[PDB]
Design a protein around this ligand. Sequence first.
Ligand SMILES: CCCCCCCCCCOc1ccc[n+](CC(P(=O)(O)O)P(=O)(O)O)c1
Ligand SMILES: CCCCCCCCCCOc1ccc[n+](CC(P(=O)(O)O)P(=O)(O)O)c1
Lengths: 305, 308
Amino acid sequence: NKMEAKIDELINNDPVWSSQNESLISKPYNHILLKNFRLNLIVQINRVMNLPKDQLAIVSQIVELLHNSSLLIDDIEDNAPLRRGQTTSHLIFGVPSTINTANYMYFRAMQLVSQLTTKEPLYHNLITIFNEELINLHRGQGLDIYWRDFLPEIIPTQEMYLNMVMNKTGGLFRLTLRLMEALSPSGHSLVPFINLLGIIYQIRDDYLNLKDFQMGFAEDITEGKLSFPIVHALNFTKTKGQTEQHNEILRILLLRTSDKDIKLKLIQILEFDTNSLAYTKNFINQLVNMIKNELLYIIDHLSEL
Amino acid sequence: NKMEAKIDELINNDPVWSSQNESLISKPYNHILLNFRLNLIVQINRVMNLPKDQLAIVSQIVELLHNSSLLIDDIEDNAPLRRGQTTSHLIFGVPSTINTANYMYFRAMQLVSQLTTKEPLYHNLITIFNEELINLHRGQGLDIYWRDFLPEIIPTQEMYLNMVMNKTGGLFRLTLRLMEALSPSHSLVPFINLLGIIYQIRDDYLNLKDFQFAEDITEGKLSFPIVHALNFTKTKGQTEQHNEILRILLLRTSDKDIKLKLIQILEFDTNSLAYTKNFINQLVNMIKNDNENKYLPLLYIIDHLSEL
Ligand SMILES: CCCCCCCCCCOc1ccc[n+](CC(P(=O)(O)O)P(=O)(O)O)c1
Ligand SMILES: CCCCCCCCCCOc1ccc[n+](CC(P(=O)(O)O)P(=O)(O)O)c1
């Protein structure tokens, strides 16, 4: 009778959850927090959008949770040992706790959307925006992962790479921008521009990962990523009949090596044999010119987003 | 010129995603697809009476969240098997399987938007979805925390039960609350919470009894019988027995003999398996002997609960 009484109370109440419980499972998240530029981009865009400061703070909080959770998952998916100079959370807390915590935070971000407005129709549109772009992020990330983990089953072309980026990287840029446009009390949609910034952002990220090492650890090679320069190299070699170079690029990607000389050989194949680094540097410039023809500040600090 | 024209087209359209791209991303999910849940949904629909097309979407939502949970749980537990078959992550890799399972959570989320077009009620369905996914993750995070930090914290039966209310109760409550909010007709949440609890304890119980693979031991899980055994030995001041249980859990062992040794500790020293069997039987009687229908508004469901 005492047991049934205790069970009866348990099942007729909400689940018990303490602030101690909350802190214990937030460890992976508090850790990546230790790692303003994203705020700056939102603030600049707001000069166009004019959301009041309180609503903008909530948009920013949503973005931070989604961005940091994506990073925790990403580092697990990439077997990344370091993030911004420090040990990745999954190596400290384990893969299980980090996945669970990152996913928990996607839902906390979802929860915040309801703090943006009391108007049901608007609320509906905001959640639809949140839902669509998170679908988009997972689609792009799934393609990137598939190409990499199943190489050489699929050799993406430049067009395929760009479409994967539109989903993968464009997802969070458009999510932030679309919520703002929807909330704005105030010209043409800025979605095209934010798609371009996300593409510049990704290709420049791929580029610097190698260029910094040729002159960071070029960890994209260790991970076997189908980066923009690698995609150009693989298609260039196929096209020109450079069979051995095409096969060697694939072999080095498939080694998942941390040997620096092997990584340097691959980068110098890209520098002298396929001219992929020059091709990419020129591609980024052409993309930056499409705009330049506060914003420039952002574009020069794009790598700190 | 040409490069810019192509980029202009690209940024001005929605992201390109093909049916073939969708198939690639779906592979880890289709693998786990290869019934009793629909049965329980149908049965409960006699009280709720949602129209059939609406009941079907609830069922699809339930299948997405449940299958996605299993794909992640198997990664979180490093499980090599799920229903006798090789787990998805060992075939498609952990990376693709985490991403695909997470993608399915959001596809589930999109189906919620299709349950109704009434803005008020829609907000309610999303709030239900959101609240219970949050609870499922709090519960699973605590279950994982105890397992991975052992022996830092040893839960008591009461702490284990609150973990289960969050972890296992979330999907039971999610499905039932959506149905109750959609009903064109007393809440059954208390009843569904109790099923949830019976479900998890019997699951913990059978993992050890079927062996008597006992994978829960290899995982170092704070299962209901283990929680009982650890707290029984502590109370009875049986220091060496308490530490022996901890040592076997900490071995993350697949050795059949060592696993049997832990079970013999639970059978002969703490009598934990008989205590659990009796605990489940009592939970079940709280329903069987519910004449004045306090929880009830079945017998078959409860007897086949181990296959939800
Ligand atoms: C209006 C601004 C809102 C916030 C903008 C957020 C900018 C960063 C977007 C990151 O997009 C992704 C998507 C998927 C994975 N990652 C991880 C990168 P990294 O491991 O190099 O840090 P990526 O794998 O894209 O190189 C990044
Ligand atoms: C009225 C129908 C409700 C939806 C169907 C509910 C079916 C049971 C859902 C159980 O939910 C969980 C939550 C967390 C983990 N698991 C996996 C179990 P297992 O690995 O033994 O299959 P668990 O690790 O909790 O024993 C299952």
